[PDB]
Design goal:
CATH class of chain D: Alpha Beta
Order of helices and strands of chain D: EEEHEHE
Number of strands of chain D: 5
CATH topology of chain D: Nucleotidyltransferase, domain 5
Strand content of chain C: 15-25%
CATH superfamily of chain D: Ribosomal protein S11/S14
Oligomer: part of a larger assembly
Strand content of chain D: 25-35%
Number of domains of chain D: 1
CATH architecture of chain D: 2-Layer Sandwich
Largest interface: C-D, 26 and 28 residues
Helix content of chain D: 10-25%
Number of strands of chain C: 6
Distance between the termini of chain D: 51 Å
Number of helices of chain D: 2
Chains: A alpha+beta (216), B alpha/beta (283), C alpha+beta (181), D alpha/beta (128)
Number of domains of chain C: 2
Chain lengths: 216, 283, 181, 128
RNA sequence: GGUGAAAUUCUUGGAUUUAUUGAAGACUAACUACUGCGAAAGCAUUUGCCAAGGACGUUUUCAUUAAUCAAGAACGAAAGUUAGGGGAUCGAAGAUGAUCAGAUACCGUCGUAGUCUUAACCAUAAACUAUGCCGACUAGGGAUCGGGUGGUGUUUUUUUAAUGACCCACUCGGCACCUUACGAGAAAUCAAAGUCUUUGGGUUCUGGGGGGAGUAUGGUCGCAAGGCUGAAACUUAAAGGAAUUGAGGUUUCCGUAGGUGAACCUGCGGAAGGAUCAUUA
C-alpha cells in the first residue's frame, strides 16, 4: 500500500585510489525527508567486495576487502579501508593433514592513530626429496618462526600508515619478506596474511580523505 | 491390563476393609468382579465407577437375579473428572498411573472417608510408609503423614495376577485424620517442594537458588501489597535484604546444618511458623 | 556474457580425477556444451559459458553441481545420474554433529556405518536408492529429497548405537513401504 | 557495462529456507520470502519445491526492482549444528540459476566456531 | 520454532532474517596422526616468569647406597557436600502440549541445583592393557618420536664456510604395528599370556561354585552422601561360567545424583565385554 522501493534512490559506492578499479557498485537509500537526513545514515555501512573485482586479475580471488563509508556529496559517496579477509574455502583448501599449522597475530598502532590487528598463517612442506610422509616441525622451530613473523609484521606496519600498508598488501611483498627471513629455519610453504582489521580510529580527517580520493 | 487371579488374598482384602453393614463403599476399579460381589453382600450400598462401558455392562449383567442387585450403582467416565457422591469407605484396585494424584484427591474431599484399602506398587507403598531418617523419606511421605495415616497390610507377589507382572504389589490402609490439621495446604506443599528439591543438602543451602528467592520476593511484595506498607531502600532488589531476614530465621530454628531427609515433622512445623511470624509465605 | 565457476579440488582427489578426466570432458562438451579448463597452478577447475554455446545457465549450474559431487568422492555414474536428472541432492553432515563420539568410539561408529565389506552401507544402497560416501568423519548422501531424508534417518539412528539388526528390520520395512508407492 | 550488483543470503536450516537479497551492504534489504509462505502443509516448507518457488518469486521481485546481478552467499544454521547447507539451499541456488539472473563469487559463510559451547542432546544425542 | 504427524511458545509495540557496535561467561574446532608428555587420574591459542622431568652424550663423581613392600602417607575422572564469586551455553528436579492401533519415526518450550572458580571436604569408575613391579634370554620386517655418530650425499646462505631442513647407514631409549610358531593355551589368541608333569631369579596383593550379598552385626573414617573391613541361616544340582562350530519395547554396561506405571526415565563422566567399505600413500 506504500511501496517504498519507488521512494528510494540509488547511490554509487567507490573505492580509494590505491586499487585500480576504483568503482565498487550501487546501493539504495531512502529519501532525505524531514527529521531524518541521508548523510548521517551513510556513516556506518561496511561493504565487502572481492579483490579480483578491484584489480581485474583472478589471482586475488581468495581475498575480500571490507570498506567503510566516510563522506557523501553530489550523489557520490567516498569510502575508506576497513579490513581484509580470506574466503573460507581458501582456508579449507590450505589446511590439509600431515603438516603443521603456524598462526600469529600482532596488534600495532600505526604512524597515525590506527590501532590494527594482523593475522599471519604458515604451513610446512617437504623439499622434493623426502620419503617421510608428514614433515612436522618441532615446537622450537614453531616458536622461532612465530617470533620472526611477529617482529616482521610489527616492523612493517609500525613505521607506516595504512595507505602504503595496503599498497604493499596488494602485491603481498610481506609474504616474500617472511619467506626470505625464515628460509634458514624451516622450508615453510604457503605463507599468507590471512586477516587484518581496524580496532581503534582517530578523528574524521576529511583532508586525508580528499588527498586519497578526488579522482575520475 | 492385569487381572487379580488369586482367590485367597481377596478374602483378606475384604475382611481387612472393616465394613460394618451400614457403610457406603466407593469401590474404585472393580476389575473382573471377584471383589465387588462380597462388598455388595456385606454393605448396604456400593457405588463403583468404571471406565469401560463393556465391562460395566458385564458387571451389571453379573448381578442379575442376585438379591444384592438393587444395592449397586455404576458410574461412568474418568475418575479425576467426575463428582463423587457420598461414601464412607474406599477400596481402590486402579491402574498405577493415577496413584500419585488421587491419594491427594482423598485428602481434598469434603467430609473425607474413614478408611481406604489401596492396592499400590511396592516402591510407592514403601515411599508412603517411610519414616524420617530412612532412605525413602520424601515429600510424598511427609504429605501422607500430614493429611492421613498409612499402614501396610500384606505383601502381594508377582504370580498372583493374570498375567504375572514384573513388579510386586502391596496392600495399604489409609485413614484421613479427623479433624484435619489446621496448617494451610499450599504453603506446606511449597515449603516441602523447596526443602525437598534436594533430599540430602542442608536447608540453608536449599535457600540459595535464584528461583526460590525470586518467588519469595514476589510473595513478600504481595504481602506488603495487601498489608499496605512501602518498600524501603535496597542495594539491588529488596530480596537481598530478605536474604539476611532468612539468615536470621536460620539462627533460631537451628536447621541450617540439618537436612530435609533427616528432619522430623516438628522441625518442619517450627520452621514454617518461623517464616510465618517474619511475614514470609509460599502461596 | 561469459560466466565462470571456480571449483577447488583436494589433492587426494586429483589422481582419480585424471584417471576419469578423459571420461568427463567430452560429455561436458557434447551433451552440455560448457567449456572446461583444469588449472593445476591453482589446483582448480574453471567452468565457463559463452553465448556462442547453448543458451542455458542451468547447464552451467548442473556442471558445477556435477563436479562438486565428483570432488566429494562420489562415483562417476552417480554424478552422470545427477547430470541427467533434476532431483538429486547431496546431504552432508558429521558424526559429531549428531552425537559426540571421541577416540575409539568414532572409529567404532564408522565401522558400524560401513559394516563388514561395506554391506550394511550397501543395504542402504538397496533400500533407499541413494548413494552414501564416507569421508574420514564426514558422510555424504546423494539422491532424492525424501530418499536422502530416510537415508539420513537410518544412518543417524545407526550412529547413536543401535544394533545393525534393528536397522536391517527398518530397511526391510522401508523397502516394503517404498516399493508400493 | 551498466550492471547493478547486490548480494543474496541463502539461509538453509532444517525446517525452512530463507532467501534475502540486499545491496552491496547488508543495509536496506529488498525481498525475503521463505518456504513457509509459499506452501501450506506445515511439512513441505523445508522441501526443495517450496525453496525453488520462493527463489523464483524473489527472482521476479529482484528483476522488477532493478538489480540484475547478485553475489550469492549460502549458509546453514551453523554454530554447533550441521554447518553445511542442505538440499533447500542447493535448490534455491539452482532456481536462481534457472531465473537467468547474473551470479558471481560463490562462497559459503556458515558460522563455524572455535570449539564453542555445548549443543543440545545431553550426551546421548538427538534420538532422530 | 519444532517433530513421524501436532501443540505450547515469540510476532503488524516488527517475530525470524539482514547490517554496525558492545557486554557476559564457557571452550580451544580445522592442523589431530594406530603422534607426544605425566605415577595414574589426565594434558591442546600466544607470550613471559617459577620450579620439575625422561632419553641421549661424558676417559665426571661416590662404591652397593639396591628390588618388592604389612604400618603409615601424597595424588586421585565425573557426580556429590559447606561457605564466597560472577552465572553465557547445556541442563537432573520442576512447570506446562498432545497422547494419534504405530511411536516402528516415545518428543516441545521455559528452566532450579549443577556445569566455571576460590577456600575446605569425599575417595569411587568398564579408574581397562579387564594383563603387579624389578632382572635375563629367545624371531623375521617396515615405518615413526627424542638424543648421538659417520657421509671430498642434496638444498637455502650470496658464495656455497657453521647452522636449519632432507636423504643414506648405524646406535640408545620409547609409542605401537604386519607375518610366523622355537614354544604356550581349553579356545579366542599371546614376542609373552614363552623359557613347565622334563615343574624353583626376587617380592607384594588376590581367588578357592551361584544366589542369599558387598546384605546383616561390630569397628574405623566422612558434615552428609557414603568409603574400608565384612558373615551366617536358608536354597540349586537338567546350578554358575569361558571360547568356537554344527501385545509392546529391543545397544550392553560402570561410578554417581535425582524422580516414579508395568523394577523404568533423565543429567555428568568413562568403557566395547559392538560389524572399516570406497580414494590416496
Amino acid at each position: 500500500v506504500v511501496d517504498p522501493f519507488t521512494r528510494k534512490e540509488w547511490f554509487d559506492i567507490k573505492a580509494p585510489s590505491t586499487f585500480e578499479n576504483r568503482n565498487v557498485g550501487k546501493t539504495l537509500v531512502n529519501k532525505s525527508t524531514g527529521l531524518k537526513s541521508a548523510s548521517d545514515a551513510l556513516k556506518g555501512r561496511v561493504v565487502e567486495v572481492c579483490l579480483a573485482d578491484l584489480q581485474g586479475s583472478e589471482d586475488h580471488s581468495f581475498r575480500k576487502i571490507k570498506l567503510r563509508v566516510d563522506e557523501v556529496q553530489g550523489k557520490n559517496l567516498l569510502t575508506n579501508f576497513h579490513g581484509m579477509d580470506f574466503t573460507t574455502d581458501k582456508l579449507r583448501s590450505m589446511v590439509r593433514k600431515w603438516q603443521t599449522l603456524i598462526e600469529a597475530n600482532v596488534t600495532v598502532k600505526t604512524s597515525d592513530d590506527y590501532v590494527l590487528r594482523i593475522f599471519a598463517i604458515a604451513f610446512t612442506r617437504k623439499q622434493a626429496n623426502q620419503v617421510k610422509r608428514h614433515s612436522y616441525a618441532q615446537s622450537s622451530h614453531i616458536r622461532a618462526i612465530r617470533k620472526v613473523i611477529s617482529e616482521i609484521l610489527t616492523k612493517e606496519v609500525q613505521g607506516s600508515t595504512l595507505a602504503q600498508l595496503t599498497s604493499k598488501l596488494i602485491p603481498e611483498v610481506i609474504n616474500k619478506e617472511i619467506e626470505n627471513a625464515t628460509k634458514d629455519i624451516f622450508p615453510l610453504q604457503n605463507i599468507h596474511v590471512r586477516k587484518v582489521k581496524l580496532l581503534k580510529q582517530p578523528k574524521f580527517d576529511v583532508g586525508a580523505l580528499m588527498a586519497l580520493h578526488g579522482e575520475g | 491390563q492385569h487381572i487379580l487371579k488369586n482367590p485367597l488374598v481377596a478374602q483378606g482384602i475384604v475382611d481387612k476393609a472393616q465394613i460394618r453393614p451400614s457403610d457406603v463403599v466407593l469401590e474404585v476399579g472393580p476389575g473382573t468382579g471377584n471383589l465387588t460381589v462380597r462388598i455388595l453382600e456385606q454393605a448396604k450400598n456400593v457405588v463403583a465407577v468404571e471406565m469401560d462401558p463393556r465391562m460395566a455392562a458385564e458387571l451389571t449383567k453379573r448381578v442379575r437375579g442376585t438379591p444384592v442387585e438393587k444395592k449397586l450403582e455404576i458410574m461412568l467416565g474418568d475418575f479425576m473428572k467426575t463428582e463423587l457422591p457420598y461414601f464412607d469407605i474406599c477400596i481402590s484396585n486402579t491402574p498405577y498411573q493415577i496413584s500419585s494424584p488421587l491419594v491427594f484427591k482423598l485428602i481434598n474431599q469434603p467430609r473425607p472417608p474413614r478408611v481406604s484399602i489401596l492396592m499400590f506398587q511396592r516402591e510407592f507403598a514403601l515411599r508412603l510408609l517411610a519414616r524420617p531418617g530412612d532412605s525413602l523419606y520424601c515429600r510424598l511421605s511427609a504429605n501422607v503423614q500430614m493429611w492421613a495415616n498409612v499402614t501396610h497390610i500384606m505383601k502381594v507377589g508377582k504370580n498372583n495376577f493374570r498375567p504375572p507382572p514384573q513388579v510386586e504389589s502391596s496392600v495399604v490402609r489409609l485413614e484421613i485424620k479427623n479433624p484435619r490439621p489446621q496448617v494451610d495446604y499450599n504453603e506446606w506443599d511449597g515449603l516441602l517442594r523447596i526443602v525437598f528439591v534436594r533430599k540430602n543438602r542442608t536447608i540453608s543451602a536449599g535457600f540459595k537458588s535464584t528461583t526460590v528467592m525470586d518467588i519469595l520476593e514476589k510473595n513478600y511484595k504481595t504481602f506488603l501489597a495487601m498489608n499496605n506498607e512501602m518498600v524501603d531502600d535496597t542495594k539491588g532488589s529488596m530480596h537481598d535484604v530478605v536474604k539476611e531476614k532468612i539468615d536470621t530465621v536460620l539462627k533460631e530454628t537451628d536447621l541450617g546444618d540439618k537436612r530435609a531427609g533427616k528432619c522430623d515433622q516438628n522441625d518442619f512445623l517450627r520452621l514454617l511458623y518461623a517464616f510465618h511470624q517474619v511475614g514470609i509465605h509460599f502461596s | 556474457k561469459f560466466e565462470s565457476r571456480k571449483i577447488m579440488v583436494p589433492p587426494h582427489r586429483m589422481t582419480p580425477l585424471r584417471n576419469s578426466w578423459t571420461k568427463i570432458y567430452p560429455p561436458l562438451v557434447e551433451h552440455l556444451k560448457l567449456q572446461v579448463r583444469m588449472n593445476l597452478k591453482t589446483k582448480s577447475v574453471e567452468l565457463r559459458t559463452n553465448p556462442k554455446f547453448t543458451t542455458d545457465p542451468g547447464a552451467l549450474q548442473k556442471g558445477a553441481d556435477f563436479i562438486k559431487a565428483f570432488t566429494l568422492g562420489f562415483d562417476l555414474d552417480d554424478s552422470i545420474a545427477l547430470l541427467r536428472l533434476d532431483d538429486l541432492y547431496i546431504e552432508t553432515f558429521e558424526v559429531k554433529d549428531v552425537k559426540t563420539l571421541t577416540g575409539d568410539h568414532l572409529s567404532r561408529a564408522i565401522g558400524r556405518i560401513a559394516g563388514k565389506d561395506g554391506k550394511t552401507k550397501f543395504a542402504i544402497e538397496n533400500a533407499t536408492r541413494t548413494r552414501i560416501v564416507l569421508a574420514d568423519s564426514k558422510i555424504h548422501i546423494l539422491g532424492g529429497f525424501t530418499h536422502i531424508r530416510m537415508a539420513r534417518e537410518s544412518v543417524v539412528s545407526l550412529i547413536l548405537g543401535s544394533p545393525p539388526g534393528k536397522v536391517y528390520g527398518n530397511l526391510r520395512t522401508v523397502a516394503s513401504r517404498l516399493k508400493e508407492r | 557495462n551498466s550492471q547493478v550488483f547486490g548480494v543474496a543470503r541463502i539461509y538453509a536450516s532444517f525446517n525452512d529456507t530463507f532467501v534475502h537479497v540486499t545491496d552491496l551492504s547488508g543495509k536496506e534489504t529488498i525481498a525475503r520470502v521463505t518456504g513457509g509462505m509459499k506452501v501450506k502443509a506445515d511439512r513441505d516448507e523445508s522441501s526443495p519445491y517450496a525453496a525453488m518457488l520462493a527463489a523464483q518469486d524473489v527472482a521476479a521481485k529482484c528483476k522488477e526492482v532493478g538489480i540484475t546481478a547478485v553475489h550469492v552467499k549460502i549458509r546453514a544454521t551453523g554454530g554447533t549444528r550441521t554447518k553445511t547447507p542442505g538440499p533447500g539451499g542447493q535448490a534455491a541456488l539452482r532456481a536462481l540459476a534457472r531465473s537467468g539472473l547474473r551470479i558471481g563469487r560463490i562462497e559459503d559463510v556458515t558460522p563455524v566456531p572455535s570449539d564453542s559451547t555445548r549443543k543440545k542432546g545431553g550426551r546421548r544425542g538427538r534420538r532422530l
